[PDB]
Design a protein around this ligand. Structure first.
Ligand SMILES: *[C@@H]1O[C@H](CO)[C@@H](O[C@@H]2O[C@H](CO)[C@@H](O)[C@H](O)[C@H]2NC(C)=O)[C@H](O)[C@H]1NC(C)=O
Ligand SMILES: *[C@@H]1O[C@H](CO)[C@@H](O[C@@H]2O[C@H](CO)[C@@H](O)[C@H](O)[C@H]2NC(C)=O)[C@H](O)[C@H]1NC(C)=O
Ligand SMILES: *[C@@H]1O[C@H](CO)[C@@H](O)[C@H](O)[C@H]1NC(C)=O
Ligand SMILES: *[C@@H]1O[C@H](CO)[C@@H](O)[C@H](O)[C@H]1NC(C)=O
Ligand SMILES: *[C@@H]1O[C@H](CO)[C@@H](O)[C@H](O)[C@H]1NC(C)=O
Ligand SMILES: *[C@@H]1O[C@H](CO)[C@@H](O)[C@H](O)[C@H]1NC(C)=O
Length: 1324
């Protein structure tokens, strides 16, 4: 008879012990020894990697566990060989292939949110656990990818402490929207986790559109309620425009227009016949509704999908035994419900379900269609348990009920020659780890000593023998997430009677964590404490706390039991046996290879509050104090704990804290107001109680504004107003406020309810009328010479006659470094916006140059280093937006017709220079270089297919020379990645063009810089020729290029600054310092109050030049005592500059007098820059003044209408040919906003940016043909006595080519139109 039944799983997994079940039956000779070995057939040879051996006794089902394969093993040809021998005979010796499973460890990536906004911090944790949820100490590499698959930021060789790595990643202001990715590279495997980044637009008001998802054709009443409500809680009293349309292409797809007043939330009861007509299983009905408030002009839309059930009743079959074993009892829990969701018990029971049983013998013999009437229970799962005849092959159950006469067919007859069958079954549902569960073994014949075996995650985790038909098993963590219990025994004839039950085992963790809130309900901005109680000391805990609104989207970025189950389900993988009609199939159904001599025959943006990460040491209980955020929400806290001994443990339930207040105050402030205007502060009191309350709103009296409410009551000045707030919102109390002082003003509104009180303080910026003008004058106190111990300079400025009194502001700064002022103003070097492609580099390349200068000078502080690198990463993230699909970079990304070689070269050079500091994706560099090198002509000339944005390089005459000289310099930094960049023909072309004769200063400067960078022998001649054209004046060298359309200003042209910077770089690259110093002196004295130069490009080039050249100066000691005494500073203001405060920008606010003047007296050694900054506002503003642009703003708006102001801005460029990229800044009138997508992008308007009451239009180019753009603005705040706003168009790369005009609406709100109908409020 049979003697052995050695069974092994068919898979191999690194890090998992291979266990082999050995059963020696009764008719076995003696104690055998079973050896097992894992052979690796990598090459043609076979290497016995692992092996095990054991002596097993007769009549005992035991296990043989191999040593675990090392976790770093790769996919090889693995073959498990088992050989069992006794004192003489070898009973069996066989081998089989093992399928390789690459899921070795469990890696969880936990981001605090699934959906992110721009300017948000992605906080992410990485948890690395073994298959048994113990911490896995390893060195992982973290990578972050944007949706275009660009390496944004990586961390390398991160050593995980108890398997947990906590990190943060700062998103930029304008990232690439889409699905980002986090990749964790443990060993040779990579684990992914995507988080979505999407832009957030203010929804204004929301619509709910509640409808039942599953309805029935026979349901008379169907209603869809649409709840329109403003964000402040007030319902919208608007007329819904509704379209109730199907997607049934065979139908008409007409829309029933139930367009009337919603009145907050109305009923929309429908008719059955009407819906039959509209229909004439459907495509789901799409409900689309829209409310449009007339004044705002804003409309919100929602799509709601409504599927359809055929009948009023729904009968569904599940939990059915997929194997039809004759002489056994079929069982299936069949649910009865109704499309409305209300079973209604007796009322819809209507007596019995016949549950027609169709038994068939599958002939072409025993054909029975008998029906058994059974009553419907209240639960609906009647769980019929009818028997099966001895030869029934096919079963069809047809439950005939009043609705949904559903059918089910099962066709799988288990084949057994002896007609012997068993069946493993379970009654329990909550099958957990450590909790025993019962198993019942039904059988149609005599049952012998059963033998069970459990397979889980492709590993044989338990064996044994049971002598009874009812036995209990206790799962362990290895059994999860889905065990497979195979019960079998062997009859006398060597037939294996067996059955499989697949049991979902719930996972219970030994490690336990409990979170407790101090208070279940707390007020906002209250200090509560979160209490963490863990099992054992030396545990690392990660706790997240998020708004209750989350999880309605089923966010996958959290360590919850669902995510743990999903992770564990990746272990349980393998081919599944569709058929189970034989014992061999029964064994194989859970991946088992059986070696036996028996007859085995083949046949929605949720904000985050707490991101706590604490390494609890000796403590098993720790309390952390936190502040409840101001918003009225509900915060649920969840967390995990990891310890070395017990492993992982999750919180069973999230614990909730309700942030509740009796009422809440909302203020609606205009952000900016001009001095002299009178705005209307509206305060809204959202009342959350269930009964009307009488709140009392008070504004704290301040000297920086006057409230115009001349109250009727005596004593009280009208700063207080009492009102009755009904339940659930309703208050819009208005205070007319006239600011008096300028700057930032705080307004503090305090509401005193009888029960509670609250206060809200908000800041309003009050500016001065007119256009803001600036002046800056710098001097370099070059006290290095010992003879020049004392130095006296004078800085003067005379205000224009049309200055706005009170808007003047004079200050003076001193700093002890040549590149000083650029250090402080790294965050913002220029006042222009940088939403375009090239301009964004103004927050990137200067960081490179400052870090290079400070590292060379050995003065780089850690804090400044980290700030600079953070700016570098933000600049890189923002810049990668403007990369086109063909690898190019353009000024406006993919909106441009084609990329620009000039800007691609600029970005390539900057990224190559930023390699040693931050991490740049090399694929971006490779694609950019590949795109560039296709544009080199036969003679070496580079040409730019992109749109001209810099008229000097790209446009004008000598364009090929400047483009070649720029791109040749930019490509040299790529010689690291490719030592054979063939630019010798380009160099020869530049040399020939230089020998031709260069007249312009800018072209010659670029030629000199190119020839110096490539070390061409003509470079010395070019630089000598460029120097001799300079202006030697006052120990300074500079180049002045004349133009008759530049507004007079302190600052020179961008072209002149670039010329000086390139000449200085040429002097540096040729190792000529003494004759380069004057250019350094001049270049250092032409910066603005922010430490930057005029435009973006000139600023980057000049900062590069000053960083490269200032590093060669000797400033080892500097001790300067600057004294500032003059008419504008009566008291002598003294700045001390030492070797410690070298980079400190020492500032002092001077008085305002006409004319401003200061004498600066300095004594000592070293370099010091002293700068006088004046900021003022001229009153008002083509004509005889020097303006390159002719601008005209015509405000056309009806006098009767006070809410809409449409202005037509017509501009033209009276200059040589076309201009470069231009910027139009439209300042809106106080209390006016331009709705989004109001200005359509066109061939001219390339980008519209909506700042706070300001529009930045990036015009492509302006020429002599008049270009007119319409700006429609809609009132959102009531502001009386509005002051004139301004429209200013400038050339981006030459700000002195500018034109500014003033405008104002011809109709104004009066002083007392601000007040509402409230009593006691009398401004007129
Ligand atoms: C290049 O720069 C030099 C130096 O500023 C310019 O030379 C000056 O040109 C102006 C206007 O023609 C004269 O009034 C000065 O006397 C010149 N100063 C010199 C030669 O030292 C030169 O014009 C510039 N060239 C171009 C093409 O812009
Ligand atoms: C600032 O400097 C100016 C010029 O260097 C000084 O003006 C001279 O002052 C002296 C003495 O006060 C007079 O004798 C001269 O006639 C002045 N010349 C001019 C052109 O004004 C001025 O006094 C200095 N102011 C301070 C406060 O030191
Ligand atoms: C599993 O394998 C590891 C390493 O191969 C070994 O240390 C351990 O003892 C094995 N487990 C059993 C139960 O033999
Ligand atoms: C096992 O080995 C025997 C003897 O070499 C062979 O007859 C049989 O086909 C092998 N495979 C099995 C039993 O699956
Ligand atoms: C099967 O059902 C029949 C009839 O309901 C019952 O007599 C018998 O005991 C049942 N057997 C099992 C194993 O459920
Ligand atoms: C001005 O630019 C517009 C827009 O491209 C073009 O249609 C027109 O021909 C240009 N006119 C001149 C004189 O350059």
């Amino acid at each position: 008879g049979p003697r052995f039944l050695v069974t092994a799983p068919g898979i191999i997994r690194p890090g998992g012990n291979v266990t082999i079940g050995v059963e020696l039956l009764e008719h076995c000779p003696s104690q055998v020894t079973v050896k097992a070995e894992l052979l690796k057939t990598a090459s043609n040879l076979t290497v016995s990697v692992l092996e095990a051996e054991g002596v097993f006794e007769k009549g005992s089902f035991k296990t043989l566990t191999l040593p675990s394969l090392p976790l770093n093993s790769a996919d090889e040809i693995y073959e498990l060989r088992v050989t069992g021998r006794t004192q003489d005979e070898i009973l069996f010796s066989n081998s089989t292939r093992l399928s390789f499973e690459t899921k070795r460890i469990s890696v969880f990536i936990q981001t605090d949110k699934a959906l992110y906004k721009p300017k948000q911090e992605v906080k992410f944790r990485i948890v690395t656990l073994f298959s048994d949820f113990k911490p896995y100490k390893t060195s992982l590499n973290i990578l972050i990818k944007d949706p275009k698959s660009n390496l944004i930021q990586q961390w390398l060789s991160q050593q995980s402490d108890l398997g947990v790595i906590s990190k943060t990643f700062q998103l930029s202001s304008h990232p690439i929207l889409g699905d980002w990715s986090i990749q964790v590279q443990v060993n040779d495997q990579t684990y992914y986790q995507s988080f979505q980044v999407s832009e957030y637009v203010l929804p204004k008001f929301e619509v709910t559109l509640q409808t039942p998802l599953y309805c029935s054709m026979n349901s008379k009443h169907l209603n869809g309620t649409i709840t329109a409500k403003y964000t402040y809680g007030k319902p919208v009293k608007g007329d819904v425009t509704l379209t109730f349309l199907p997607l049934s292409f065979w139908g008409k797809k007409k829309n029933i227009t139930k367009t009337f007043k919603i009145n907050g939330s109305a009923n929309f009861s429908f008719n059955d016949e009407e819906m039959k007509n509209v229909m004439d299983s459907p495509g789901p009905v799409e409900i689309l509704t829209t409310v449009t408030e007339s004044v705002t002009g804003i409309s919100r839309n929602v799509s709601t999908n409504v599927f359809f059930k055929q009948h009023d009743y729904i009968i569904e079959f599940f939990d059915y035994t997929t194997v039809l074993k004759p002489s056994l009892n079929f069982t299936a829990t069949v649910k009865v419900t109704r499309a409305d969701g209300n079973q209604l018990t007796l009322e819809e029971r209507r007596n019995n379900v016949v549950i027609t049983v169709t038994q068939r013998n599958y002939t072409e013999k025993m054909e029975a269609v008998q029906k058994i009437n059974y009553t419907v229970p209240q639960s609906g799962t009647f769980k019929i348990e009818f028997p099966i005849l001895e030869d029934s092959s096919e079963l069809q159950l047809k439950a005939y009920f009043l609705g949904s006469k559903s059918s089910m067919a099962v066709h799988s007859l288990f084949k057994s020659p002896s007609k012997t069958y068993i069946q493993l079954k379970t009654r329990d549902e909550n099958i957990k780890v450590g909790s025993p569960f019962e198993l019942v073994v039904s059988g149609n014949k005599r049952l012998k000593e059963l033998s069970y075996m459990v397979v889980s995650r492709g590993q044989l985790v338990a064996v044994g023998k049971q002598n009874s038909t009812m036995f209990s098993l206790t799962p362990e963590n290895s059994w999860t997430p889905k065990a497979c219990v195979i019960v079998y025994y062997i009859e006398d004839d060597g037939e294996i009677i067996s059955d499989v039950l697949k049991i979902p085992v719930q996972l219970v963790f030994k490690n336990k964590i409990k979170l407790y809130w101090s208070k279940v309900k707390a007020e906002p901005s209250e200090k509560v404490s979160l209490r963490i109680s863990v099992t054992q000391p030396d545990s690392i805990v990660g706790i997240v706390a998020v708004d209750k609104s989350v999880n309605l989207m089923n966010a996958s970025n959290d360590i919850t039991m669902e995510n743990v189950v999903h992770e564990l389900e990746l272990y349980n993988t393998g081919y599944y046996l569709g058929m189970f009609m034989n014992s061999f199939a029964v064994f194989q159904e859970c991946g088992l290879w059986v070696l036996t001599d028996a007859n085995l025959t083949k046949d929605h943006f949720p904000e985050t509050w707490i991101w706590l990460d604490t390494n609890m040491g000796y403590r098993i209980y720790q309390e952390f104090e936190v502040t409840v955020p101001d918003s009225i929400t509900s915060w649920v806290a969840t967390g995990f704990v990891i310890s070395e001994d017990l492993g992982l443990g999750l919180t069973t339930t999230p614990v909730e804290l309700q942030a509740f207040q009796p009422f809440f105050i909302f203020l609606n402030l205009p952000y900016s107001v001009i001095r002299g205007e009178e705005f209307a502060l509206e305060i809204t009191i959202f009342n959350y109680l269930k009964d009307a309350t009488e709140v009392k709103v008070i504004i704290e009296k301040s000297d920086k504004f006057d409230i115009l409410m001349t109250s009727n009551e005596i004593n009280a000045t009208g700063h207080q107003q009492t009102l009755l707030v009904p339940s659930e919102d309703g208050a819009t109390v208005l205070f007319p406020i006239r600011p008096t002082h300028l700057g930032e003003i705080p307004i503090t509104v305090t509401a005193l309810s009888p029960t509670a009180s609250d206060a809200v303080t908000q800041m309003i910026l009050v500016k001065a009328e007119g256009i803001e003008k600036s002046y800056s004058q710098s001097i370099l106190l070059d006290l290095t010479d010992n003879r020049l111990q004392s130095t006296l300079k004078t800085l003067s400025f005379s205000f224009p006659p049309n200055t706005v009194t009170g808007s003047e502001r004079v200050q003076i700064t001193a700093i002890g470094d040549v590149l000083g002022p650029s250090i402080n103003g790294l965050a913002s070097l220029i006042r222009m916006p940088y939403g375009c492609g090239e301009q964004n580099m103004i927050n990137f390349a200067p960081n490179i140059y400052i870090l290079d200068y400070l590292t060379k000078k050995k003065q780089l502080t850690d804090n400044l280093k980290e700030k600079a690198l953070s700016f570098m990463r933000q600049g890189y993230q923002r810049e990668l937006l403007y990369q086109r699909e063909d690898g190019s970079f353009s000024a406006f990304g993919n909106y441009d017709p084609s990329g620009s070689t000039w800007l691609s070269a600029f970005v390539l050079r900057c990224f190559l220079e930023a390699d040693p500091y931050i991490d740049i994706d090399q694929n971006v560099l490779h694609r950019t270089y590949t795109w560039l090198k296709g544009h080199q002509k036969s003679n070496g000339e580079f040409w730019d297919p992109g749109r001209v944005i810099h008229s000097e390089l790209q446009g004008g005459n000598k364009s090929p020379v400047t483009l070649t000289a720029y791109i040749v310099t930019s490509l040299l930094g790529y010689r690291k990645y490719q030592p054979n960049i063939d630019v010798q023909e380009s160099i020869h072309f530049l040399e020939s063009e230089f020998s031709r004769g260069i007249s312009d200063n800018y072209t010659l400067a670029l030629i000199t810089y190119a020839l110096s960078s490539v070390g061409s022998p003509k470079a010395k001649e070019a630089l000598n020729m460029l120097t001799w054209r300079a202006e030697q004046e006052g120990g300074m060298q500079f180049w002045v290029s004349s133009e008759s359309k530049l507004s007079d200003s302190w600052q020179p042209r961008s072209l002149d600054i670039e010329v000086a910077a390139y000449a200085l770089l040429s002097h540096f690259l040729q190792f000529q310092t003494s004759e380069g110093i004057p250019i350094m002196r001049w270049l250092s004295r032409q910066r603005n109050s922010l430490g930057g130069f005029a435009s973006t490009q000139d600023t980057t080039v000049a900062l590069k030049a000053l960083s490269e050249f200032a590093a060669l100066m000797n400033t080892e000691r500097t001790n300067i005592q600057v004294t500032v005494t003059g008419p504008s500073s009566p008291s002598p203001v003294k700045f001390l500059i030492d070797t410690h405060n070298r980079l400190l920008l020492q500032t002092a606010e001077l008085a305002v007098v006409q004319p401003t003047a200061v004498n600066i007296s300095a004594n000592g050694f070293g370099f010091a820059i002293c700068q006088l900054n004046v900021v003022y506002n001229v009153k008002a503003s083509s004509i005889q003044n020097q303006e390159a642009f002719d601008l005209d703003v015509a405000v056309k708006e009806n006098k009767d209408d006070l809410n809409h102001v449409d202005l037509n801005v017509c501009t033209s460029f009276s200059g040589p040919g076309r201009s470069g990229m231009a910027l139009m800044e439209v300042n809106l009138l106080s209390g006016f906003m331009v709705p989004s997508e109001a200005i359509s992008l066109s061939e001219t308007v390339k980008k519209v940016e909506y700042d706070h009451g300001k529009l930045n239009l990036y015009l492509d180019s302006v020429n002599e043909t008049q270009f007119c753009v319409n700006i429609p603005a809609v009132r959102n705040f009531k502001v009386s006595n509005t002051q004139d706003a301004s429209v200013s168009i400038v050339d981006y790369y030459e700000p002195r080519r500018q034109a500014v005009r003033s405008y104002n609406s011809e109709v104004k709100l009066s002083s007392c139109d601000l007040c509402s109908d409230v009593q006691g409020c009398r401004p007129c």
